[PDB]
Amino acid sequence: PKKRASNGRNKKGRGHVKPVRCLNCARCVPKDKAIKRVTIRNMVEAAAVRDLSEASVYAEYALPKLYNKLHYCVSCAIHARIVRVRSRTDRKIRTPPQ
Amino acid sequence: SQVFGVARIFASFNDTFVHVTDLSGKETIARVTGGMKVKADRDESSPYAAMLAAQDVAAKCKEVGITAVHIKLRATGGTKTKTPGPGGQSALRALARSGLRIGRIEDVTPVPSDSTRRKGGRRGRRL
Amino acid sequence: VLVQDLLHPSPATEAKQHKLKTLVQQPRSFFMDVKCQGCLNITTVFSHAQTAVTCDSCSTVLCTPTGGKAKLTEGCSFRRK
Amino acid sequence: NINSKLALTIKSGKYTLGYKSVVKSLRTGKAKLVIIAANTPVLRKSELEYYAMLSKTPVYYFQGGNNELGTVCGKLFRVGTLSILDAGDSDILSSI
Amino acid sequence: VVDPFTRKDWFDIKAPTTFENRNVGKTLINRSTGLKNAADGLKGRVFEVCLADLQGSEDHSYRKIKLRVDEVQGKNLLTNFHGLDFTSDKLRSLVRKWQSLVEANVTVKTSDDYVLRVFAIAFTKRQPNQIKKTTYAQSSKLREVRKKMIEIMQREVSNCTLAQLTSKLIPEVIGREIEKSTQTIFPLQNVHIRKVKLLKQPKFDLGSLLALHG
Amino acid sequence: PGRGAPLAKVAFRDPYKYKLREETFIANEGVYTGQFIYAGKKASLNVGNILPLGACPEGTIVSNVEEKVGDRGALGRTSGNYVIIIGHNPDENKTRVKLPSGAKKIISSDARGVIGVVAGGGRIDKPLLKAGRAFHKYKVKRNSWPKTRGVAM
Amino acid sequence: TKRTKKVGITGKFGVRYGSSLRRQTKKLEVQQHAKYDCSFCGKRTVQRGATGIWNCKSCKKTVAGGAYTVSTAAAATVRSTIRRLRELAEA
Amino acid sequence: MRDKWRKKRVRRLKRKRRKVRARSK
RNA sequence: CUUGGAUUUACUGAAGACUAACUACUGCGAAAGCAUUUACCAAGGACGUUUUCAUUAAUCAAGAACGAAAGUUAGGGGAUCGAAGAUGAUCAGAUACCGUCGUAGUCUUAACCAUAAACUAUGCCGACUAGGGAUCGGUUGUUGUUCUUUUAUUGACGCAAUCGGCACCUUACGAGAAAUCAAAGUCUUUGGGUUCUGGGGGGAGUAUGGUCGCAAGGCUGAAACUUAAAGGAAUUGACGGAAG
Ligand SMILES: [Mg+2]
Ligand SMILES: [Mg+2]
Ligand SMILES: [Mg+2]
Ligand SMILES: [Mg+2]
Ligand SMILES: [Mg+2]
Ligand SMILES: [Mg+2]
Ligand SMILES: [Mg+2]
Ligand SMILES: [Mg+2]
Ligand SMILES: [Mg+2]
Ligand SMILES: [Mg+2]
Ligand SMILES: [Mg+2]
Ligand SMILES: [Mg+2]
Ligand SMILES: [Mg+2]
Ligand SMILES: [Mg+2]
Ligand SMILES: [Mg+2]
Ligand SMILES: [Mg+2]
Ligand SMILES: [Mg+2]
Ligand SMILES: [Mg+2]
Ligand SMILES: [Mg+2]
Ligand SMILES: [Mg+2]
Ligand SMILES: [Mg+2]
Ligand SMILES: [Mg+2]
Ligand SMILES: [Mg+2]
Ligand SMILES: [Mg+2]
Ligand SMILES: [Mg+2]
Ligand SMILES: [Mg+2]
Ligand SMILES: [Mg+2]
Ligand SMILES: [Mg+2]
Ligand SMILES: [Mg+2]
Ligand SMILES: [Mg+2]
Ligand SMILES: [Mg+2]
Ligand SMILES: [Mg+2]
Ligand SMILES: [Mg+2]
Ligand SMILES: [Mg+2]
Ligand SMILES: [Mg+2]
Ligand SMILES: [Mg+2]
Ligand SMILES: [Mg+2]
Ligand SMILES: [Mg+2]
Ligand SMILES: [Mg+2]
Ligand SMILES: [Mg+2]
Ligand SMILES: [Mg+2]
Ligand SMILES: [Mg+2]
Ligand SMILES: [Mg+2]
Ligand SMILES: [Zn+2]
Ligand SMILES: [Zn+2]
Ligand SMILES: [Zn+2]
């Protein structure tokens, strides 16, 4: 039977969406279907943010961030626990996790 | 004040390059890779190998007169991954803890404005 | 609402309806008498005019057509007929 | 746009089509405008505008060839040049 | 076997007077020998230094300047402007979702015949009283803004020499004028000249260059 | 006869004595009878004009190009072929061009060429279909056809 | 009536030379015997002489063209490219 | 077997029948 | 692949592709599809309209136009990936998955092909039946808001209506075997108009004839024979080299 009303993608009123390659396995996946996560991480791990600030030649220099947008296909994301299997009724919930 | 070089760190998932040049980048001062510190291929990109590689780089810098460096970290880029390898974080901390002074830090990963086909095929690499 | 006076809708709610969706369809447009500031000559102008109307005396554009109602130029006063 | 104005003159006014009629119409001073096709030979062109300079007649240079000038006038033949004798319901003379 | 660093001679890099802290740093090259002079193989080098370093202030931390050496006087290197660029992280921090990104570029030559390509970038501004999630501008307005960018960069470059323009880039004169000039089109934020490239240089004039070094 | 490219006969005046000089140029496509041909350093970029290589910007399509200054045309003379100007070296007065074989050549910037593509192109697209057609083709070229295979002697 | 279903002008060649050579010949041989529009007088009276030679019967102007068409695509591309490059050079 | 490969098997087998029948043309 | 200096580094140049980030349960198109700027060319829906014509219309065998990718023919291009092929591994075996090379192809110009899970597995036109909040395009009334420029005749934003779209949320009058459905409702209380298709499972989209195609193949399309099930949705369990 039909498992999801959205067919696992985000294509409505559209014929074709150009594909993207998965970061993990380089599989061609439609842009609307890919599981996308935006991550803004510190470029230096919190253990080294002190000694690198002390080693800085600049007083009060702010470390730049690392901006990245990751694209995954369905097999990579499920395997890497980026998304998880939800119950039949819990699948419908599409608000971001709290 | 300080005498700056440029530490061009290329951290892939198979190796870690610690490469210090001058300001122009046309003159190479020290290039120690994580593969020169281990005899196993599987840990050429290990954080441990990158730390040893950075210390050898820092030691070479001191005897030439380089007292501070700017950091230009990069990943493989191109059609491949844009996140830096595990050795890039260790080589930066090792350089700072070795008495070398740190200047500007920048990510200089080459990023296409949409470009060539990536290896692996349509169905990806099946594992 | 099961019981409702369809033959005598409230004139307030009747005016919010689309022009084709009233009991009897009726245009919301009208005709205006336009006084340009320069002179005084009655000129009948449609509210939703599609033409750059010019008064006979001086060849000055009175209004510019838009998507909906025509826009009267500055100094031009209108009175609905 | 100028084509729409010219079509009305052909429909309502008076005109002559062709090089021999245009030169005759320039001699008599009955021409209000001379229209020359883009692919008209330059020698004929530079001669038509010498007659128009003498006749004191403005000249409009059609952008298409004599194949396109003929069909604008509603004709099934080629028109290398034409003269407008009477602009009628149109306002082509006021638009050069 | 030979330790190639025994034959290196150190030189000092001097920035033009348009900046404040003109002592950029030091470089090295193989020592001048009979066959090859150190001077000729040293000119043409490009140094990429942060604009915050050339001015002290951290407000220029997101711009980095390329300096091209084209005259050597003993141990001093006389550099010139070679290009402008933003840091990668600054641009990535400006490109958010639920908003429109607009870019423009134009090729234009200065008064002294320096051919440049100048890249402008801007983003739609969310109004203080705005309620809707996204801030999108209609494509017709974006075409007018893009057109407005191009005619401002063309005007403010062709009317001045490269040195005055360098003094224009530091305070975002062009970016502030674009923001002011597009107020009646659409509210804008983060209007920046994010990159400048030198394409073609005029015939070398050492005297003109020397005036930019004191 | 013997050429795929048509030839153009162009009449010039003699600058020093009262006489007409008829030249035989290779016709570029688009050149017509009665057309004015301009030749020299100051000639304009029009089809059929003869210009020095330095006066033509990159990407200019040119034919009958001089290999050496004053040899009156050596390169790109057959039907459908041409030379693309790749770039200039004004300090050494040299120009880089791309030849019909795909080779890049460096020629003096004073060498001349004719603007356009040699007329008659697309000739090879049609099969000859007959031995007689090749016989008539080589009847006005030279005695090189037909060829006996060396393995059959 | 319609005399040949598909050979057309290549019916003069009978059954010889192979279908691929005959249909490839037919395409290019219709073009070389066609009448083209004259850019000078406007009539469709231009016909080929030898290869590269296209004459107009009316105004007697001869223009150098392609082997089988009055103008090739490469020349048309060069004509607009030269026109475009001419505008920049002459401002 | 897979429906797609069953179709390919028959397509290749249809090809053989046509070539075999052509012998007695 | 590397002391014949690889990999790396800075600067420079050349080729082809491709247009990241902005990019969304957003837009446009009959569908396939469409994402750098500008210029040119001709189109298009919606909205507005006290403009115009008056049944011109709805759906449509036959027949046309278009029709992803791959593929065919001939030129041109051939950066990157990469069928075939070659190779290093793995394995009991592995012609494969993984790794390294790589030819057609991938791009383009002239023609062919006419097929895709070409999907919404859901024909089109018309009417009605229920609430709600968003959003795109247009129109009409109106702000403790920001801004042109100092304000308007700037533009943005805010609040209401409305027509049209892409969708979404709730309910079930109602439908259904259920999964589910604002249509898949207004169907034993059975009839608004109209086009196409199916009749247990296989054999089989097979054989044959016809027709289109250069070919690969496309369209139309049986019979003999065989069988009591095959299948759909859901429930419990069992199992899973799935998650918590
Ligand atoms: Mg399932
Ligand atoms: Mg649509
Ligand atoms: Mg599709
Ligand atoms: Mg699709
Ligand atoms: Mg998804
Ligand atoms: Mg490795
Ligand atoms: Mg390695
Ligand atoms: Mg080792
Ligand atoms: Mg492979
Ligand atoms: Mg797996
Ligand atoms: Mg005529
Ligand atoms: Mg405006
Ligand atoms: Mg010769
Ligand atoms: Mg012989
Ligand atoms: Mg032989
Ligand atoms: Mg032979
Ligand atoms: Mg013998
Ligand atoms: Mg007969
Ligand atoms: Mg047999
Ligand atoms: Mg090297
Ligand atoms: Mg949009
Ligand atoms: Mg883009
Ligand atoms: Mg049909
Ligand atoms: Mg295709
Ligand atoms: Mg195709
Ligand atoms: Mg193809
Ligand atoms: Mg080919
Ligand atoms: Mg290739
Ligand atoms: Mg490869
Ligand atoms: Mg293989
Ligand atoms: Mg084996
Ligand atoms: Mg196809
Ligand atoms: Mg689908
Ligand atoms: Mg709206
Ligand atoms: Mg009111
Ligand atoms: Mg304004
Ligand atoms: Mg405006
Ligand atoms: Mg039955
Ligand atoms: Mg049956
Ligand atoms: Mg059978
Ligand atoms: Mg056939
Ligand atoms: Mg039984
Ligand atoms: Mg089941
Ligand atoms: Zn993947
Ligand atoms: Zn008036
Ligand atoms: Zn003619």
From TrEMBL, chain A:
Keyword Ribosomal protein: yes
Residue ranges of coiled coil: none
GO molecular function: metal ion binding; mRNA binding; structural constituent of ribosome
Amino-acid positions noted as binding Mg(2+) 1 in the UniProt annotation, renumbered to this chain: R9
GO-annotated cellular components: cytosolic small ribosomal subunit
Taxonomic superkingdom: Eukaryota
Keyword Ribonucleoprotein: yes
One GO biological process term: translation
Annotated positions binding Mg(2+) 2: K33
Paired cysteines (S-S): C22-C76
Binding site for Zn(2+): C22, C25, C73, C76
Keyword annotations from UniProtKB, A to Z: Metal-binding, Ribonucleoprotein, Ribosomal protein, Zinc
Family assignment from sequence similarity: Belongs to the eukaryotic ribosomal protein eS26 family.
Protein name: 40S ribosomal protein S26
Organism per entry: Candida albicans
Gene name per UniProt: RPS26A
Full protein: residues contained: 2 to 99 of 119
UniProtKB/TrEMBL annotation, chain B:
Binding sites annotated in the UniProt record for Mg(2+) 4: L127
A GO molecular function held by the record: metal ion binding
Name of one Pfam family that matches: Ribosomal_S11
BP terms from Gene Ontology: translation
Keyword terms: Metal-binding, Ribonucleoprotein, Ribosomal protein
The organism's place on the tree of life at top rank: Eukaryota
Region (Disordered): 105-127
Basic residues: compositionally biased ranges: 118-127
InterPro entries the record matches: Ribosomal_uS11, Ribosomal_uS11_CS, Ribosomal_uS11_sf
Transmembrane domains' residue ranges: none
Residues involved in Mg(2+) 2 binding: D15, E44
Coiled-coil features, chain-numbered ranges: none
Record: residues binding Mg(2+) 3: D41, E44
NCBIfam families attached to this UniProt entry: PRK09607.1
Protein's name in the database: Small ribosomal subunit protein uS11
UniProtKB/TrEMBL annotation, chain C:
Any matching Pfam family: Ribosomal_S27e
One GO CC annotation: cytosolic small ribosomal subunit
Record key words, sorted: Metal-binding, Ribonucleoprotein, Ribosomal protein, Zinc, Zinc-finger
Cofactor: Zn(2+)
UniProt xrefs under InterPro entries: Ribosomal_eS27, Ribosomal_eS27_Zn-bd_dom_sf, Ribosomal_zn-bd
Any single GO BP term: translation
Chain positions recorded as Zn(2+) 2 binding sites: C36, C55, C58
Leader peptide range in chain numbering: none
Keyword Repeat in record: no
Superkingdom in the source lineage: Eukaryota
Molecular functions per Gene Ontology: structural constituent of ribosome; zinc ion binding
Cofactor stoichiometry and binding remark: Binds 1 zinc ion per subunit.
Binding site for Zn(2+) 1: C36, C39, C55
Spans traversing the lipid bilayer: none
Family classification: Belongs to the eukaryotic ribosomal protein eS27 family.
PANTHER family assigned: 40S RIBOSOMAL PROTEIN S27
UniProt protein name: 40S ribosomal protein S27
Species this chain originates from: Candida albicans
UniProtKB/TrEMBL annotation, chain E:
UniProt GO molecular function: structural constituent of ribosome
One Gene Ontology term from the biological process aspect of the record: translation
Keywords: Acetylation, Cytoplasm, Ribonucleoprotein, Ribosomal protein
GO cellular component: cytosolic small ribosomal subunit
Annotated localization: Cytoplasm
Keyword Acetylation: yes
Subunit structure and binding partners: Component of the small ribosomal subunit. Mature ribosomes consist of a small (40S) and a large (60S) subunit. The 40S subunit contains about 33 different proteins and 1 molecule of RNA (18S). The 60S subunit contains about 49 different proteins and 3 molecules of RNA (25S, 5.8S and 5S).
Family: Belongs to the eukaryotic ribosomal protein eS1 family.
Protein name: Small ribosomal subunit protein eS1
Native species: Candida albicans
Gene: RPS1
Full protein: residues contained: 20 to 233 of 256
